[PDB]
Amino acid sequence: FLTAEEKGLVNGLWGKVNVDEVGGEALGRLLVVYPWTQRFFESFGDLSSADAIMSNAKVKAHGKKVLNSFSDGLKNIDDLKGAFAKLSELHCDKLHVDPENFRLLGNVLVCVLAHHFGHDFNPQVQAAFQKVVAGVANALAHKYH
Amino acid sequence: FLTAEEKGLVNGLWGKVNVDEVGGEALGRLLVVYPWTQRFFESFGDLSSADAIMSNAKVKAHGKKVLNSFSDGLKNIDDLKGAFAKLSELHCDKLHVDPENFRLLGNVLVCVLAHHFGHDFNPQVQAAFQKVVAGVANALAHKYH
Amino acid sequence: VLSAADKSNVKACWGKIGSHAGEYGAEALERTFCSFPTTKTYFPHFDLSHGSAQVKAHGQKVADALTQAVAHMDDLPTAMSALSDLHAYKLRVDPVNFKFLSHCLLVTLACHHPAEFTPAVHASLDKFFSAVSTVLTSKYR
Amino acid sequence: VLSAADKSNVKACWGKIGSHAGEYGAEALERTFCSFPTTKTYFPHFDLSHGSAQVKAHGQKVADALTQAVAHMDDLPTAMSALSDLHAYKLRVDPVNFKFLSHCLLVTLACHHPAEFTPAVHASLDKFFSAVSTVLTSKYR
Numbered sequence: 001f002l003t004a005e006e007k008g009l010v011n012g013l014w015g016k017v018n019v020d021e022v023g024g025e026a027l028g029r030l031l032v033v034y035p036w037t038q039r040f041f042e043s044f045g046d047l048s049s050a051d052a053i054m055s056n057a058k059v060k061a062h063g064k065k066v067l068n069s070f071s072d073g074l075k076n077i078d079d080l081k082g083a084f085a086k087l088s089e090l091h092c093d094k095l096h097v098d099p100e101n102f103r104l105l106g107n108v109l110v111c112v113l114a115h116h117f118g119h120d121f122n123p124q125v126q127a128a129f130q131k132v133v134a135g136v137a138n139a140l141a142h143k144y145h
Numbered sequence: 146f147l148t149a150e151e152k153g154l155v156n157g158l159w160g161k162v163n164v165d166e167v168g169g170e171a172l173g174r175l176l177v178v179y180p181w182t183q184r185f186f187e188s189f190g191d192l193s194s195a196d197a198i199m200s201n202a203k204v205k206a207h208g209k210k211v212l213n214s215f216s217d218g219l220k221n222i223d224d225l226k227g228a229f230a231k232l233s234e235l236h237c238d239k240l241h242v243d244p245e246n247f248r249l250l251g252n253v254l255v256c257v258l259a260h261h262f263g264h265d266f267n268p269q270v271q272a273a274f275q276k277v278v279a280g281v282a283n284a285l286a287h288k289y290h
Numbered sequence: 291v292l293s294a295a296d297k298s299n300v301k302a303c304w305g306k307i308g309s310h311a312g313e314y315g316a317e318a319l320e321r322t323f324c325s326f327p328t329t330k331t332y333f334p335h336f337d338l339s340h341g342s343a344q345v346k347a348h349g350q351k352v353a354d355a356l357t358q359a360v361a362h363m364d365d366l367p368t369a370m371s372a373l374s375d376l377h378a379y380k381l382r383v384d385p386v387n388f389k390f391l392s393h394c395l396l397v398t399l400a401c402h403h404p405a406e407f408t409p410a411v412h413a414s415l416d417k418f419f420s421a422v423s424t425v426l427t428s429k430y431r
Numbered sequence: 432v433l434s435a436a437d438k439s440n441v442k443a444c445w446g447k448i449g450s451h452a453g454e455y456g457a458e459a460l461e462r463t464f465c466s467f468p469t470t471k472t473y474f475p476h477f478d479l480s481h482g483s484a485q486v487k488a489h490g491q492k493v494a495d496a497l498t499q500a501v502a503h504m505d506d507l508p509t510a511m512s513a514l515s516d517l518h519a520y521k522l523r524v525d526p527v528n529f530k531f532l533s534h535c536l537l538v539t540l541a542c543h544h545p546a547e548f549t550p551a552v553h554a555s556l557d558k559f560f561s562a563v564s565t566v567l568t569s570k571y572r
């Protein structure tokens with residue numbers, strides 16, 4: 001579902017991402033910006049302020065895991081449904097996460113990439129990354145029933 | 146993509162549908178319940194009231210043509226994207242219809258099937274019809290650029 | 291944003307529904323759970339199997355609330371203040387889910403009351419269910 | 432619904448944007464048309480091509496309304512009344528389209544003002560953009 005150029009645009013920027021630091025930032029802002037999401041991360045500890053969320057060890061650890069699975073999706077970009085099938089079952093069956101919340105994380109991730117890359121984050125690089133986050137959200141929703 | 150079970154529920158109900166009746170009924174209700182859509186159909190004459198809309202000759206003929214393309218969608222259900230490619234371009238390039246409005250017409254059709262078929266329009270029958278309706282709306286939005 | 295004719299259409303339709311509201315309430319939920327399975331993520335504690343009494347119990351609660359709302363169309367925000375806190379602060383139900391339910395409530399009404407479900411009444415109920423959903427979603431952020 | 436902390440984060444940030452608001456208004460539209468091509472269905476009388484004067488001029492107009500929203504955060508419905516009638520009654524722009532724009536507004540700001548785009552201001556602006564977009568879609572029947 002991505003053109004050859006779009007793939008270049010995405011893989012091109014992702015190679016420059018600090019997947020360690022970007023993961024905690026994106027999950028952190030998820031919890032700050034859309035605070036209802038904190039309800040799912042109860043066992044992470046103190047989330048009582050933007051400052052507590054952003055320095056929370058568990059937020060950072062989980063953020064890294066979230067961004068590794070996003071990297072695995074970019075290898076398997078032509079079979080995103082297949083790559084995320086196990087994770088889709090988990091979020092449905094065990095975690096009871098409404099899939100609308102996947103769209104929120106994607107856009108927060110897009111905001112964080114724009115924060116880091118500035119002018120380098122073209123309107124056109126943005127578009128290709130919207131297709132990707134949409135594809136991931138859709139694939140995570142696919143095993144819900 | 147539908148299973149053989151779903152197709153039978155859909156085709157079974159569709160086999161009893163009055164084309165002229167349901168078509169003008171579905172389109173007229175779209176103009177009535179969602180009155181902003183009337184903006185796209187000004188060469189149809191009197192759309193000033195619910196009874197005007199419901200006995201409007203042009204509304205009726207267009208509902209019919211809308212319903213025949215649903216029928217052709219049903220026959221080519223394994224390739225709705227093939228089936229709606231030309232109509233997709235037309236809605237986008239010529240008519241400038243936000244594809245979010247396709248969801249409304251689909252839901253109206255389902256209410257009109259519920260009205261007509263009553264108890265026989267079970268939750269399982271409905272769920273199948275929702276898949277079709279969502280798939281026709283996805284097919285129609287696909288060639289948007 | 292309901293008009294004089296919308297409020298009368300609604301009451302009139304609600305009058306004919308009578309003691310069967312709770313049944314339509316339960317049928318409405320079953321249809322939503324079926325057609326839009328993502329709505330079930332808010333009910334992990336429920337036995338969600340077909341014809342279950344927990345869904346039937348809850349369907350009466352939704353119907354009672356709606357009967358409440360028909361009596362108070364002029365001030366839905368105060369009539370519904372408690373449900374509004376419940377849905378935004380405690381349960382945090384995403385707005386899109388209220389469109390799924392609202393849709394299935396119209397379908398349920400069309401199924402049982404074809405003579406009452408005219409193009410005009412259809413409009414008014416959509417507006418009504420739509421007004422309730424915005425009050426129940428108002429405090430979401 | 433907003434808050435004293437939100438209002439001040441918005442006011443402080445929109446002070447930083449200053450004379451650039453018109454430029455960012457245009458980039459945000461450009462970003463929305465690119466990323467969300469269905470938004471183009473409402474602009475069929477626009478030359479939408481890249482760098483077009485019509486998009487830039489419109490970007491400025493969008494940025495002035497938002498700047499006036501910053502001054503009337505405590506009375507958005509009254510300050511935005513003409514634009515509510517325009518968007519919800521005359522144009523009838525589907526609310527999903529405001530989500531796309533709001534997002535592209537956030538992205539534009541983070542590109543240009545990384546230091547001001549903190550997790551706390553990010554949240555406040557999201558709250559602000561959605562409150563503006565709420566008022567703008569009110570009159571839909």
Ligand code: HEM
Nearest residue numbers: 037040041065066069070087095097101102105106137140
């Ligand atoms: C949209 C992209 C997302 C991706 C790629 C993703 C990925 C993951 C991964 C890799 C795990 C660890 C797997 C495991 O537990 O064995 C996980 C767990 C989890 N996810 Fe997500 N997730 C996403 C969105 C969300 C959202 C929106 C929520 C809800 C706000 C959520 C809630 C959770 C929770 C509560 C866990 C378990 C936490 C724990 O480890 O104890 N996820 N997810």
Ligand code: HEM
Nearest residue numbers: 182185186210211214215240242246247248250251282285
């Ligand atoms: C979602 C399912 C829809 C289907 C299956 C459908 C189907 C069709 C078909 C087959 C035509 C052919 C007219 C012709 O060239 O003979 C048509 C035309 C048209 N459609 Fe649709 N349509 C849908 C949705 C919509 C919606 C939601 C709108 C407006 C909100 C719309 C606006 C129009 C207009 C303005 C025309 C031209 C009418 C004329 O002849 O003046 N369509 N559609």
Ligand code: HEM
Nearest residue numbers: 329332333351352355356373381383387388391422423426
């Ligand atoms: C017409 C709109 C709705 C109305 C009038 C309504 C009404 C109610 C009422 C009256 C209660 C509980 C009253 C009580 O027993 O204390 C309730 C609770 C609840 N609602 Fe809704 N509701 C609506 C929409 C929704 C939607 C769309 C969802 C999400 C799919 C939802 C999810 C829930 C859940 C999970 C509970 C708690 C059930 C329990 O724990 O027993 N509601 N609602």
Ligand code: HEM
Nearest residue numbers: 470473474492493496497514517522524528529532563564
């Ligand atoms: C932050 C949200 C928005 C703001 C502040 C805003 C502001 C404005 C302003 C200031 C005008 C000029 C009207 C006048 O000067 O009388 C306008 C017109 C217009 N807007 Fe928006 N708008 C917003 C969202 C949207 C969205 C999401 C869409 C749909 C994609 C949209 C579509 C239009 C159209 C088609 C016009 C008419 C343009 C023309 O005159 O040719 N607007 N808006």
